[PDB]
Structure formats: C-alpha cells, structure tokens
Amino acid sequence: MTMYIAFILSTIFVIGFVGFSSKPSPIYGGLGLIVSGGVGCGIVLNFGGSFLGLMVFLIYLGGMLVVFGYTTAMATEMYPEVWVSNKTVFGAFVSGLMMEFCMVYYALKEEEVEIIFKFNGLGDWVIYDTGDSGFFSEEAMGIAALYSYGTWLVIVTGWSLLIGVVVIMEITRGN
Amino acid sequence: AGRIASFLKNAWAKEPVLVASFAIGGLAIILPSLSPYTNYAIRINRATPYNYPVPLRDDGNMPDVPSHPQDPQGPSLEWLKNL
Amino acid sequence: MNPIIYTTLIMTVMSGTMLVMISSHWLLIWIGFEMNLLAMIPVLMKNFNPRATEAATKYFLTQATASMMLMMAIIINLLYSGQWTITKMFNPVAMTMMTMALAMKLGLSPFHFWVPEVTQGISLQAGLLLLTWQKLAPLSVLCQISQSINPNLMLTMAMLSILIGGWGGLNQTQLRKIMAYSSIAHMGWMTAVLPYNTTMTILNLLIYITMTLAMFMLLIHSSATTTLSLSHTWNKMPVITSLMMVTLLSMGGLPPLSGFMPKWMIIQEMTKNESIIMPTLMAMTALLNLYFYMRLAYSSSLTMFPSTNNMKMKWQFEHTKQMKLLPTMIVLSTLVLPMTPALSSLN
Amino acid sequence: MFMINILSLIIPILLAVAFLTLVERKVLGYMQLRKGPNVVGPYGLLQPIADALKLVTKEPLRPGTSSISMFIIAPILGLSLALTMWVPLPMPYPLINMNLGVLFMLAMSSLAVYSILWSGWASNSKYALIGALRAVAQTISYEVTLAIILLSVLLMNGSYTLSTLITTQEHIWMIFTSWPLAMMWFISTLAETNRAPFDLTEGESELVSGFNVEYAAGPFAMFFMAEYANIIMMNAFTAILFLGASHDPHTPELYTINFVLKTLALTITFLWIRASYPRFRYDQLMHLLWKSFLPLTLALCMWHISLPIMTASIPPQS
Amino acid sequence: SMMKWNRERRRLQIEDFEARIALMPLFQAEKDRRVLQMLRENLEEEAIIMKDVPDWKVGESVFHTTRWVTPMMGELYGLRTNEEILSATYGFIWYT
Amino acid sequence: MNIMLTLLTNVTLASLLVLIAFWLPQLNAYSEKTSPYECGFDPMGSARLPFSMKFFLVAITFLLFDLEIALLLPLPWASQTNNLKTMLTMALFLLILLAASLAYEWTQKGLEWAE
Amino acid sequence: WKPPPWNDVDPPKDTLVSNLTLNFGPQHPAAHGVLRLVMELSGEMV
Amino acid sequence: MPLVYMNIIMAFAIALAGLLMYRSHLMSSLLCLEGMMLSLFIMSTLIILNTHFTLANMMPIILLVFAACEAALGLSLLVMVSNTYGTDYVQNLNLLQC
Amino acid sequence: PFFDVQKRLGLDLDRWMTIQSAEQPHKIPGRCHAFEKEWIECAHGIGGIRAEKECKIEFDDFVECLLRQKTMKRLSAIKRQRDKLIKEGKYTPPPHHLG
Amino acid sequence: PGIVELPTLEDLKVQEVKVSSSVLKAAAHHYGAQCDKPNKEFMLCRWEEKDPRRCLEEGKLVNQCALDFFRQIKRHCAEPFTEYWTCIDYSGLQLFRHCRKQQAKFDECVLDKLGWVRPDLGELSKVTKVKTDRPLPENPYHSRARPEPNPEAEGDLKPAKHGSRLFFWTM
C-alpha cells in the first residue's frame, strides 16, 4: 500500500543492483543500473529531496549512455549474453534475488534484525521530522551554498575535472 | 595596431564565433567589478527577509532597535522602493 | 608526454597527497585520494607498453575498490556520529572496514598481489614514485585515526605483510618484483608499530622513503631491470655495485647501517607495550628479506660476473642523467645511526 | 476527475500528433509545388485515421535475430516518456505543478534516447546499429548545450518552475533578452527531436530507415508517435520559455489560445526548415556544436551569470 | 525591461515575505498547542495500553537531558489513522 | 499520488497499444520474412561484432562536460545569497575552467574525430 | 615463464580488426536500386 | 538504526561483492563500481536530508563529481586494453604474471 | 589534521562543514543542533580520551537524536502490543485517534 | 530515563481563532502593525525558553489579541475586507499584485474607521525590542556541569636531565 512506498522502491533498487551485479552483457547491466537509478531517484524524492534525485537521474543517464556507446563498440561479442543464457549469470541472478528475498523476509516480520547493524524496521514514515522550511527548500539552499561557502570545494572539483580531461587525453593518446 | 589589429581582423574573418565568445567572456568578467549596481544587488539580497527578525530583550540602553515596526528608528529600505 | 603535461600531472599527485595530509574533513581527504588516483594512471602509462596498460589497470581497479570502501566507512561514521572530522571512528564496523579500505592502498594484507604486478609492469621511475610517494597519504590517515584501531586486526595485517613479502621476495630475479616485496615487508614493519607510537611509524617511513629512493635511483643510473643486467654493471661501472651492496645491507637492516634504526626503535617500543612474541617474530622473519638482499648483493659486486665485449664502447661513453640528490640519499641511507635520538624531532 | 485531466492530456495530444502528419504532408507538399494528401474526405482530414488503422492491422513481423524483450520495451519507453513529458507544461495551469519542471523534462528527454538505443541494438542489423551510434553522438553533443542554454535562460527566471516563466515574461518576451541563446536553443530542439537537418539517426538517403528499419506496423507507428509528440512538446517548451504570452487569471482560455498559436507557429517553422535544407553529415553536426555552439553558449552563460548582478536585477526564487 | 520588472518582483517578494513574517507567530502558537495536545493524547492512550506490561512506566523520556526535543513525526502520529500519517509525512512532497 | 498515477497511465496505454498492434493483425510468419534486411542480398553476417567509434575521446569527455553541469545548475538559487562577489568569482571559475578544458581538447586534437 | 622482454615491451600482437562490410546496394534509395556497393569500412570512414 | 538504511547498505554490499568477482568483461565490473557509487550517493543523501545538515547537501554532488571522473578513467583504460588486445576480457590479461 | 596548515594560516577550507552546529546558510538549524552543541561544548580542550568517560550522556543523547531508537523501539513495542491486544478485543482506540 | 511532563488539556484550550489563510493574508500588514506586542512577546518567550510547554500563556494572549483585531475589523470594515480577502482567495498563489483596488478600499476604510496605516515596505521585518517582565532562563538548554579543564601546562623549561636519556647517547 502507499504506507511504505519507500520500502518497495528500495526493493526495486536492490533488484536492479542484482541485475547488473550478475555480470550480464554490459547493455543489460546498463539497463539494470538504469532502473536502479530511477527508483533510487524516486526514493530520494520521497525522502524530501528533489534536486538530488533528478541530478542522479540526469548524470547517471549520461554516464550509462556513454557506457552503452562504448559497449557495442569495444566491449561486445558475436554472441551477447542474457540473464538466462549462461549458467553463471543465471546463478548470480538467482543468488542475489533469493538472498534479498530472504533478507526482506527476515526484515519485515521481526523488524528487529541485528545483521551488521541493528535494524528496527517499523516504518520509514516514523523517522521523519516535524519541521518548517518557510519559503526556502532546505536542499536548494544547501547545494546553493557551494558557490558561497564551499569555495575550496569549487577549486578542488574544477581542478580535478580539468586534470581529468588532461588524463583522458594522455591515456587515450596511444603513442 | 599593426600585428594586433591584423590578428584581430584575421580572427574576425576566419573564426567569428571564437571572437564573439571571447569578447562576451571578457566583458562578463571585467564589467561586474566596474558597474556600481553590484553592491545594490547585494543589498537587495540582504533586504529580502526569509527568517523572522527575532526580537531581542529590551534591557534598556539600545536606542536604535525599534520598539514597534512602525517606529522610525531602525534600518529602512526606501532606496529599494525608489529604485 | 609533453613535459608540461607531465609536470602538471606530478603536481596534481603531490597536491592530492597534500590535501590528504592537511584536510580535516573526510570528504576532502577522499578528494585528495581521488586526485592522486586520477593523476597516477597516466604517469604509469607514460612509456605506453602493454605491460604499462596491464599494470595501470590492476592499479586502478584495486584503488577504486579501496576508495569506494573508504566512502562506505565515512558514510557509516557520519550516520552513527554525525561528524566529518578526522578524529576517531564512532562505529566499530566502520573502522574495521576502513582498516582494509586504507590497506589495499598501502598493499600489505592479502590485498597485496597488485603491488608486484604494477611494480614490474610500469617503468622504473614511476615505480620509484609509486613505492615512495603513494604511501604517505594512507599512512597519514592511519596515523590520524590510530587512537581507535582494533589492534588485533592491524597487527595481523602487519604480520601477514611481513611474512608474505619476505617469502615472496625469495623467488624473483626481477628487481622490480623483489623491491615490491621489500616494500611490503617495510609496510608490515611500520603498520605493526603504528598502534603504539606513530612517531616510530613516521621515522621508519622516512628511513624507508630515503633508502628506497637511493636504491631505485641507483637502479636507474645502472639502467638495470634483471639480475644478470645488474650483475653486468661491475665491468662498466663498479662504484654503483659497491654502493648497491651497502644499500642492500641497509635494506636487510644490518647495523650499524641506517636501516637498523627503525627496526631497532620499533622493537624498543612494542616491548615497552608488553608485546614480546611479535617483535621476536618480526626480527626472525626479516631474515627472509635479508636472504635475497644478500643474493642480489652477491651477483652484483661481491662476485664479478661474465660481461659483454660491447661494453668496451660502454666504458668509452659517460652518463648524462645527473640523478639529483643521490649522493646525499646514500649518506642518509647508510650512516645516520649515531644521530638516532633526533627522532624526537618528529615527535 | 484527476483521471479525467490525465485522459484529457493524452487523447487530444495523440489526435494532435496524428494531424501533425497531415499538416506536415500538406505544408511540405505546398513548399514543393505539390498539393499533399487530398483524396480522403475533405482536404485529407481522414489520412491520419486511415494510416493509423493500417499500421495497427498490418502484420508486425519480429526478426529472427531480434532480442524480443528490448525490441518490445523500446516502443513502450518512447511513447510513455513522450506522453509523460507533457504533464509539467504550464499550459495556463500545469497539470503537475513541480518545483523542478525544467530538470524533470531534461531528465525524461535524456531518457528518451534509450528507446532509440535499445530498439537499434535489439534489432540485430548493420543499419540499425549505425543509426543507434549516430543517435548516441548527436544526443550527447546537443544535450550539453541544451543544459547550458536552459541554465542561461532560466537565470532570469529565478527558479526551475515552469509556471513562473509566465510571470517572468509579464511585460516582454524573453527572446528580446536572450535572442542569441534562443537561436542555439531552437537548433538544439531540432536535433534532440532528431529532426531535420539533423535527422541522421534515420538517414533515409543513406541508412534506408535507420533505427526504424526493422520496425514494422504497430511498433513503427508507436516510435512515430513518440517522435511527433516530442516535436510538439519541444515547440511548446520553446514557446513557453522565450515567446511568453499574456495570462488573465480569470480567463485562462486567452493564454491557452495564445500558447497554442505559438506552438503551432514553432511547429510550422519546424516543417519549414525540414523542407528547405540539405542534411548534415554526422561529424559536422558534432563539429558544429563542440567548436561553434559550445564556446558561444559558455560565453553567454558567463554573461547571463553576471548580468543580474551588474544591473541589480536578480529575480526572486519564490 | 527585465531589470525594471525583476526589481519590481523583488519588491513584491519582500512585501509577501513580510506578510508571512507578520502572520508567523500565530502559526507558531497554534502549532505548539497542536503538538502538545497530540502528545497528551498519545500519553493518555499509552497509559491504558501499557498496563499489564511487565514494566513500561509511561511518559518516560529517552534523552537523559530535560530540555525538550522536537518530537519525531512517528511519535506524534503513531496511533493516528492511515490517512493522517500519509498526509502528515508524504503530504508536501506528494502535493503536485 | 499524482505523478505515479500519471506514469502508470502512460505505461499501460503504451503496453496496450503494443498488445493490439501485436495480437490483432493476424500475422503470417515464415523464415525468409524475418530474415535480416541488408539492402536486399543476404547480410555478410555480423550486427554484433565490434563497431569502431572514432569519437570515443569526444564521447567520454561528454561525460565530464555533462558532469560539470551538475555543479553549474545550483546557480539560480546561488545568485540569491549575501556574498555575490564570491559566488560570481566561483561561477566564472567554473566557466573559465570549462573553457580551458575545451580549448585544451581543441588544440590537442581532441574533438577532431579519429580516422 | 619466459623472462620479460629486454625492452620491456611485448611484441605487437597480430591483427584484430573486424571492419564492417555491408551491402550499400539494391533497394537502397541512394544506390539507385540496381547497384551493389560492397564497402569495407571501419565504422563510418570507408 | 532505521530500515531504508538496511536496503541501501545491503545493495552496496552486493555491489561490492559483484565488483570483487569478475566473469568475462571489463565493462561489467565498471558498471558494478558505478552501482557502488549510486548506493553511496543514495545513502549519504538520505543521511544528510534526514539530519537537516543543510550545509552538507553538496557532498553527494561532489561524490557524483568524482564518480564520473573515475568511470571515465576506467573506461579509457578499457579503450587501451581493447586497442592492444582487440577485446576487453580480463582472463586474457595475463602478460604481467611473469 | 596531520599537517594543519589551516590553523597556521588562519584560513578556513573545510572546518565550516565539519559539524552540524556551524553557521548554516540562512541560519537554518540542524535537526540535532542543540545536542551537538551541548556535546561539543562539553568536551572541548578536555581531551579526546577524556571525552568518552566524561561527556558520555551528552554524546549518547546526541547519537539518539541522530538515530532515535531508544525512542523508536519504544514506539515499535507500543504499536506491537496495541495491534496484539486489539485483535481479541481488549482495547478499542478512542475516536480522536482514527478520525 | 525521566518524565516527559506535558501540560494538561485545560491549559491549551484557547479560543482557536478561525479564519482561512486567505483571510489572514488579506489583513496581514495591518494585523502585524496593530498586534505586534503580543506576537513579539510570545516569540521572544519561545526563543528564550526554547520550550513551548512553558510559554503557553503567551500563546493564549496572542490569540486573544488576534481575535480582538478581527472583531474590530468585523465591526468597522466588514464589506471591503470581505471583498479583498475573497479576491485574494481566488488567486492560486494569493498574490497581492492582482488585488490592488480592493486593497485601496480596505486601507482607506481602516484608515478612516479604525485609524490604521499599512506598514511601509520592510517596516514589518525590523528587529523589535520587547519589554517582557519574565526572567532570563539561566540554563535554557538544561546543560549539566561541564567537565573540569585539563591541568594547564606552565613553568620554566630547563635542559632535559642527562640529555636524551636514550640508550648510550649521553648528549
């Protein structure tokens, strides 16, 4: 029901993660990461953040498009594989899906799982805070302070991007 | 002139898009410091109230702080109304 | 590579290391790590051989895995504490995860198979850079957070580094591989002394840095990469091999040479911390390092080897590369023992 | 009746897309001294229905080398996103009054390329793969300038909400303030919609049919649906951005009429340029942007970054 | 033209913001009364609900300090109906 | 409430149209009909072998270029701060560094396609 | 395990090129429908 | 220690496991790496949005910033392994073993 | 920091983002500003080794405010017991708790 | 461990002023002008005590003054205020921009019927000084006793006794 929403979207996130973590053909892995990123943007949206989710959306679609363009160019084969073609990728997909199935099973009944960290799974609506943002979204003023407060971050990120172009040039020079 | 003027003219001849982009960039870099309205902009951003002007306890002395919004003493933004 | 581009890439590597060693925010330390990783790959790819591509790859994916792991640790720490400051980890899982997250960067644990591979594949100069400069940053982070380490994990890491490095060095004739294993052993020594007194870690790191610099630039000036080629240097140029063997005796840590001073001081520290089995274990297993050090020294200077006739022309022509700071480096590499108490300057 | 609104934003849009084909085949034909479709009923007003009927009763063959799953999921993706990106448009009152409508539409426009991508790859053809890669290059090149130009233009808006554009252009069209960018923006709208003179993904002269070459009957008609809905939506977005229109709060029908007329004019200019140019050659449309559009749009981005500050004209965010 | 219009819009936004400022104290008073009333209702419900429990002394604070904490939205609407929690938590995020 | 109801409406309408397109027309399929189209004659045989893309450098730097727009996009909210001097300097810093990156690529072949 | 080359470069491997070869030929609108242009091309550069 | 955090952490765990296991290709491992990055972004965004750490919302943006840079460098490495190797598989990348 | 150049030059590069109680834009308070402020002001200059023993309940309150399940466990067991006993008719919710 | 003290339902039984948001927005400026004392006192109590469980009486008094203001505007200028707030309510964003004539009628009505003038631009956003008579909370955060600072390091420095004292190194 609409009670959880974030729970179901997190399960789709994990399923998309299993899809590309099973080492399928890189196009299919790209598709799996695409659905995972879309539902993750949905989670971030449902958790009171709009700019961050759409930024994940746009940036990851750009990156995954370039991954596709390289995949069918460089990292392809005469016989592309599917999630059911090979027994190894099928085994990885099966392991991931049944695993997350039993994790969420142990999660949503007991709701007190200890695994790694104590996970009291009552509901994500609970942890929300009663607050007032006035006439400014908190996330907007947050990422808008990069040009006013985080000048050092501006400098380091710009320098890293420029030198990243430089290295993308040098690595791909080929004598 | 001479070499510099010839180079400018040849760049206008060959690659006008680069000339236009560089001119626009240089203008947008160096004008904002010279233009006097920049400070005005800052003041406007300071004028816009997002949070409540939380009142302070009147323990006497301070004359400047108004005791009522209509009171004359205190900051005013008639300049923004006129401008 | 255009020389200006190489200079900029080196400056970016150094700036990433400096950002690691000067920032308090965790994100900034990771940014320094990222800049270091980003600028390191082209330096390896400078010579552009398939060996370089292989090594640069194996370098990349290991470092990327370690850095992503480091983010998992930072994010867990922030979730459980709400702080980005580099003080200590407030979640045991986060720190017992970052310990190996910062370990693959050093290459001491079973997360070490990448080190000999990258060392052998890439050129000798970039190998010097990788084995000397690329270890100050993760070691600096470990020094800052040493207050809240699980000593069992760190000591096990150090022991495995020492043991496998010393053993693997016994079975390679390529100089790059046995230097990688020696670097693993020295990583084990410093990481073992890390939890008790970080000043001794800094002292050992400095001694190792200068001494590996001296060793590697001697190798470059000899233009040797295999044991036979280095052995052949005696006919062309004997003083290089003469300094080679002394620097190798320092590699093994035989006193009164400089290399003893860390090995000595470390042993003095942990025995103050009621640790007795561990120092004895390391002292005995450093002999595996010493064995291939003496094997290299034997077939470099102590026994002159069959040379090649064309070296008659090689003697005819002198060197051109200056190899700056080399004569000073040898001096701090062999005789600084009488000035041992100067380690208090680090503290 | 929210369902009523949703259906009223789909069926009329599909009908408009259908009649877009007829108005194209008529306007184009009249450019070329022809008459265009004229036989079916009066003035060809039944051609869209006729070929709509054909394309959904003609046999939809599936190639033996295809990848079934993506071959089917691509048309659904294309049409679903083409229809979805109509919901945040501030037609008098937007159906979905989102705070980040511009970013949302950018995201879905970037997603729409994946329909082309998967359809081209799954079809297992030389021509289809060629067209898919040309689409890759075209949309990345033009997406960079799309994002930069959108930022530059919206710097005077104050936020990314589409409705405030109407408030922004209360007294003057935005094109009088950013006419250079507008030109570039228009070209980008020509290329992202994969239309002329950048319609190299299809490339009828050199790629037979591009990524639609193995797409027959219903799926082909559906990809055409996505393409033409994207054409009309892009022209609508351009009209909303630059050519603002008066909006009486009491009679939104006036703004509806003005907005619809502006979208119609922009679409007519699309067909106009489609019938008045040769076709670009792959790298050129890349070398057009990475060497002429990108520097100019960067310079204009700095100019519009500085402009509110130097004149004390920073727009409000609320 | 854009300069003049944007300056006028800035003045209008200042006017609207000062109106919101003038009105905020009533909203603050009403909001604090509503949250206190809701907490009281939850405490009274907890008194009856936690009776046969081994040891669930009601109205107990979690933080060792006595300064009030902005109550989490779960402990403000835990016993409320489904529509109440849906509208309270995913209300502004879902209103488009 | 509204956005996923919308998205669902579009996806089910599309899947339906696909269903009527694929089940109604009474297809008759044979092997040569679904044979790959290669301008008539039978294809040489490939359609999945590596297809060289010479803008690989251009394609990858698109990733960095589109990445920077993430830093760039907070500008409409960044202009409305009390430190306009620092904001202007940093925005011009980003734009100048992007210009420098593009110029470095342009001069060092870069944007020019491989042959 | 033969020792690495003296120049530390592996010899350049054999050719691995798989350039496309499509029938720019019949039924193609550009090829007039009665041409069969078999073009050995790498990507787009013929 | 709430629930959504469990799902994102578990997703990161499977992505870490997937990265640390190769089957044939180099692109798939890189995709698994960017999935790890995605999980990191979602987790950090959840944390800072929940805690109202307004000044820290730039942190996921910087995460993505360096994310794309690493992805680019890795796929350029794959370009070179393809140029010198024809393909991208890792099991044939063995020339450095001796 | 290892080599704290920031204090030497008196230049702020990352200290503004280190803690939640710093000067946020538009004076937006953090969710747990009060607890973080109390904990930080507690163990300042006292020593990072004395902080654990001395400023313990302050940090415990802060970490609770961050994660909140000495409070959310309370809620979970409250809801569990309510749904348990309501099933067989021991308790019925009051009208204001369902409308 | 402790008591979450909550005032009983009787204290927070205010008269609960009932006007819609549009009605409130219509009378925003005049209300802020002629009701500033209760709002300011209540908010200073809220910010100082940092405990809404304590300043409930100011929350009562602000509502009383707001109801008095609305009763006055009902008694003197009902018709112009009704038309003005309806015209404000029509707008989706409740902008004052479209509704200026009705604003003029309302302003002149309250000016010549209740002696009111709308605050000028920015007047309603100036920090005010209140003359509240409550004491200043000594420990608003209820902070416990701070740990004693570490023993301060002081004293003249002399050379290290017998040098380094590190093994055989005498000096």
Which is it for the CA torsion E93, E95, F3, F8, positive or negative? positive
Residues paired with residue J129 on neighbouring β-strands, in sequence order: B56
Chains contacting B (3+ CB pairs below 8 angstroms): A, D, E, F, I, J
Side-chain-side CA neighbours of residue D278 (13 Å): 5
Q: Dihedral through CA C224, CA C230, CA C232, CA C238, nearest 10?
A: 100
Contacts of A172 in chain F (CB under 8 A): 56-57, 60
C-beta of residue D271 within 8 angstroms of C-beta of residue D27: yes
Q: How far apart are CA D120 and CA D125, in angstroms?
A: 8
Experimental technique used to determine this entry: cryo-EM
**DSSP state letters, C269-313:** HHHHTT--HHHHHHHHHHHHHHHHHHHHHIIIIIS-----TTHHH
Q: What's the DSSP call for residue F113?
A: P
Alpha carbon of residue A48 to chain centroid: 17
Closest approach of A120 to chain I, Cα-based (Å): 7
Contacts of A62 in chain D (CB under 8 A): 110, 140, 143
C-beta of residue C193 within 8 angstroms of C-beta of residue C155: no
Element (H, E) at I22: none
Alpha carbon of residue D304 to chain centroid: 25
Chains contacting D (3+ CB pairs below 8 angstroms): A, B, E, F, G, J
Instruction: For helices F84-107 and B37-47, give the axis angle rounded to 10 degrees.
Output: 120
Is H52 in a helix, a strand, or coil?
coil
Residues paired with residue A75 on neighbouring β-strands, in sequence order: none
Is E72 in a helix, a strand, or coil?
strand
A 10 A CB-CB count for A22 gives 28
Q: How far apart are CA A34 and CA H35, in angstroms?
A: 10
Q: What's the DSSP call for residue E51?
A: S
The one-letter amino acid at J96? F
Let me know how many helices (H) and strands (E) chain B has, helices first: 4, 1
Q: Supply the CATH number for residue F3's domain.
A: 1.20.58.1610
Q: Find tokens 């690691």 and name the residue.
A: C20
Q: Do chains G and H touch (3 or more CB pairs under 8 A)?
A: yes
Residue numbers of F between 44 and 63 with CB closer than 8 Å to D = 46-48, 51, 53, 55, 58-59, 62
Most distant pair of Cα atoms in chain C: their distance: 70
C-beta of residue A13 within 8 angstroms of C-beta of residue H42: yes
The CA-based angle I92-I97-I98, given to 5 degrees, is: 85
C-beta of residue E7 within 8 angstroms of C-beta of residue D156: no
Which is it for the CA torsion J119, J124, J129, J133, positive or negative? positive
Contacts of F56 in chain G (CB under 8 A): none
Residues paired with residue G22 on neighbouring β-strands, in sequence order: G39
CB pairs under 8 A between C and I: 59
Domain of A38 in residue numbering reads as 5-173
Is F54 in a helix, a strand, or coil?
coil
Which is it for the CA torsion H53, H54, H60, H66, positive or negative? negative
Closest CA to C174 of G5, G11, G12, H92: G5
Query: CB-based contacts of A62: which residues, under 8 Å, 6+ apart?
Result: D110, D140, D143, F62, F63, F66, F67
A 10 A CB-CB count for B54 gives 14
Query: CB-based contacts of H64: which residues, under 8 Å, 6+ apart?
Result: A55, A56, A59, F67, F70, H37, H41
Q: Supply the CATH number for residue A144's domain.
A: 1.20.120.1200
Residues paired with residue I50 on neighbouring β-strands, in sequence order: none
I12 touching C (Cβ < 8 Å)? no
Query: CB-based contacts of H87: which residues, under 8 Å, 6+ apart?
Result: A75, A77, G16
Q: How far apart are CA C236 and CA A115, in angstroms?
A: 65
Is E6 in a helix, a strand, or coil?
helix
Contacts of G11 in chain C (CB under 8 A): none
Pairing state between β B56-57 and J129-130? parallel
Nearest CB among E1, E7, E9 relative to D172 is that of E1
Q: How far apart are CA C72 and CA H35, in angstroms?
A: 13
Q: Is residue F99 part of a domain?
A: yes
Residue D112 tokens read as 């729409």
Which is it for the CA torsion D64, D68, D72, D74, positive or negative? negative
Alpha carbon of residue H25 to chain centroid: 15
A 10 A CB-CB count for B4 gives 8
Q: How far apart are CA F2 and CA G44, in angstroms?
A: 46
Residue C32 tokens read as 């320094």
Which whole-number Å values give the CA distances from C332 to C188, C214, C325, J167, in the listed order?
22, 9, 11, 21
Alpha carbon of residue D156 to chain centroid: 23
Contact F84 B29 (CB under 8 A): no
Is A113 in a helix, a strand, or coil?
strand
C-beta of residue G44 within 8 angstroms of C-beta of residue D206: no
Q: How far apart are CA C233 and CA C220, in angstroms?
A: 12
Contacts of H95 in chain G (CB under 8 A): 10
Q: How far apart are CA D209 and CA C320, in angstroms?
A: 64
Is G42 in a helix, a strand, or coil?
strand
CB pairs under 8 A between A and B: 4
Q: How far apart are CA C239 and CA D34, in angstroms?
A: 93
Q: Which residues of C88-106 are buried (b: 16+ CB within 10 A; e: fewer)?
A: bbbbeebbbbbbbbbbbbb
Helices (H), chain D: 2-8, 11-31, 47-55, 69-84, 101-122, 126-154, 163-168, 179-192, 218-241, 252-274, 283-288, 294-311
Q: Phi then psi for A83, rounded to 5 degrees?
A: -65, -10
Closest CA to F32 of D57, D214, D64: D64
Contact D127 G22 (CB under 8 A): yes
Q: Which residues of C58-86 are buried (b: 16+ CB within 10 A; e: fewer)?
A: bbbbbbbbbbbbbbbbbbbbbbbbbbbbb
Residues paired with residue G40 on neighbouring β-strands, in sequence order: G21
Number of domains in chain F: 1
3-state secondary structure D27-61: HHHHHCCCCCCCCCCCCCCCHHHHHHHHHCCCCCC
Closest CA to H74 of H37, H29, H23: H29
Is A76 in a helix, a strand, or coil?
coil
Is J17 in a helix, a strand, or coil?
coil
> By CB neighbour count within 10 A (0-12 exposed, 13-18 middle, 19+ buried), where does B29 fall?
middle
Closest approach of H97 to chain G, Cα-based (Å): 9
Pairing state between β G20-24 and G37-41? antiparallel
C-beta of residue E67 within 8 angstroms of C-beta of residue J51: yes
SS3 content of chain B, % helix, strand, coil (to 5): 55, 0, 40
Q: Is residue F41 part of a domain?
A: yes
Number of residues assigned to chain I: 99
Closest approach of B59 to chain F, Cα-based (Å): 30
Q: Which residues of D280-290 are buried (b: 16+ CB within 10 A; e: fewer)?
A: bebbebbbbbb
The CA-based angle D67-D73-D76, given to 5 degrees, is: 150
C-beta of residue C24 within 8 angstroms of C-beta of residue I14: yes
Contacts of F98 in chain B (CB under 8 A): none
Number of domains in chain A: 1
Domain of F39 in residue numbering reads as 1-108
Residue A121 tokens read as 């799974």
Residue numbers of F between 51 and 90 with CB closer than 8 Å to H = 56, 60-61, 63-64, 67, 70-71
Q: How far apart are CA H90 and CA H96, in angstroms?
A: 12
Q: How far apart are CA J158 and CA J163, in angstroms?
A: 11
Complete domains list, chain H, with CATH:
3-92 (1.10.287.3510)
Query: CB-based contacts of I78: which residues, under 8 Å, 6+ apart?
Result: E46, E49, E50, E78
Q: Which residues of D193-225 are buried (b: 16+ CB within 10 A; e: fewer)?
A: bbbbbbbbbbbeebbbbbbbbbbbbbbbbbbbb
First vs last Cα of chain B: how many Å apart?
43
Closest CA to I16 of C18, H58, B49: H58
Closest approach of G29 to chain D, Cα-based (Å): 6
Residue F83 tokens read as 């430190």
Contact D132 A72 (CB under 8 A): yes
Q: Find tokens 């001395």 and name the residue.
A: I54
Is H51 in a helix, a strand, or coil?
helix
Q: How far apart are CA E94 and CA E1, in angstroms?
A: 37
The CA-based angle C74-C77-C78, given to 5 degrees, is: 85
Q: How far apart are CA A50 and CA A56, in angstroms?
A: 10
Contacts of I57 in chain J (CB under 8 A): 144
PDB resolution in Å:
3.4
Q: Dihedral through CA F20, CA F22, CA F28, CA F32, nearest 10?
A: 150
Instruction: For helices H58-85 and F56-72, give the axis angle rounded to 10 degrees.
Output: 180
Closest CA to A42 of A18, A79, A6: A6
Phi-psi label, residue D210: left if phi above 0, alpha if psi -120 to 50, beta otherwise: left
Contacts of C57 in chain H (CB under 8 A): 77, 81, 93
Query: CB-based contacts of C284: which residues, under 8 Å, 6+ apart?
Result: none
Q: Which residues of I69-89 are buried (b: 16+ CB within 10 A; e: fewer)?
A: bebbebbbbbbebbeeeeeee
Is J166 in a helix, a strand, or coil?
strand
Query: CB-based contacts of E2: which residues, under 8 Å, 6+ apart?
Result: D156, D172, D177, D313
CB pairs under 8 A between B and D: 57
What are the contacts of A94-98 at 24+ separation with CB within 8 A?
A96/A17, A96/A18, A96/A21, A96/A22, A96/H14, A97/A15, A97/A18
Chains contacting E (3+ CB pairs below 8 angstroms): A, B, D, F, I, J
Q: How far apart are CA F23 and CA F15, in angstroms?
A: 12
Contacts of I34 in chain H (CB under 8 A): none
Instruction: For helices D252-274 and D218-241, give the axis angle rounded to 10 degrees.
Output: 120
Contact D110 A51 (CB under 8 A): no
Contact A136 I26 (CB under 8 A): yes
